[model samples]
Target: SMSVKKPKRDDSKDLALCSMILTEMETHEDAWPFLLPVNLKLVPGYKKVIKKPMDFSTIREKLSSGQYPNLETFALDVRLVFDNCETFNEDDSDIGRAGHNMRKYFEKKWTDTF
Candidate 1:
């Protein structure tokens, strides 16, 4: 049998990586909830780490950076969010509806922002 070593959990590193990913995707308002799984992957027990303002700040810095790392990886993540958002059942009203509304908001905002 083969055994694999688990990666050590580093709160700071995980936060940094996750923040970078979030900030880039923030422009896509429909992406928030589907990203829950991704965030939880970074910070175990996710609910504990998700609510702080500093978390948002970290994400902001990444998005604001002139140079972004891993364009392909980031694009893949964005597509995953979009595809998952599409798969939501009607019962997911709160999360799904919010995402729907946000995309409409994005369509309007994009013209002015770009």
Candidate 2:
């Protein structure tokens, strides 16, 4: 059996970023539909790290543990996901619109926070 080795790098910062983004998505009604499990499946390898549908609570728990190491890398990782979103080009699709909006939202939040 091939085993997947977890990275030596810490993931606390990434969890925190995801938590904040999830929180923001919760605030917008239009973003709710986009948060469904089906949408997560669109991102390659997301299921491996997340294991299940990601929720704000799970991420918040990780944040509460007070383990944030690499914020810059976390931001880059997030940008990569947005960059890889296949629906991003389909302006007419809901996923596409949400992806675009989220890209801006995350960028602004990262700038404001960092």
Candidate 3:
């Protein structure tokens, strides 16, 4: 009799995207209204400080209507989350370790399972 092994998981984009989304949900003070409506709780440590709601509905509407914000914020946020779990430091080397660790962890689990 032959035994079958389960398929390996692919964690690159999916894991990064999921972590980004969760961190956005967790640490972003501006997300309370939406998170509240959805019954999701942010992590319990940080204080939420908001001058006003960010109005992502308006952001989405405007984006659909064709005006996107400057790339600086988007690039910084994406790079920070995907590369460094939204951390900031004085040098790129700070991000390299986290990024490398995530990839290596995923690869190990993948190979081990399948």
| Candidate 3 backbone collisions, by pair | none
Of the two candidates 2 and 3, the one with more favorable TM-score, higher being better, is: 2
Ranking by lDDT: 2, 1, 3
RMSD (Cα, Å) for all candidates, in order, is 13.0, 9.6, 15.1
Writing each residue's lDDT as its tens digit, candidate 2 over 10-85 gives 5545665556765785576555434444445576665555433433343344445644345654455445444544
Count of backbone collisions in candidate 2: 0
TM-score of each: 0.36, 0.48, 0.22
**Which one is best on lDDT?**
2
Error of 3 at 17 (Å): 18
lDDT of each: 0.46, 0.55, 0.37
Best by TM-score: 2
The candidate 1 region of ten consecutive residues with least summed lDDT is: 49-58
Q: Answer with 1 or 3, whichever has the higher TM-score.
A: 1
Residue pairs with backbone overlap in model 1: none
Q: How accurate locally is residue 66 in candidate 1, as Cα lDDT from 0 to 100?
A: 31
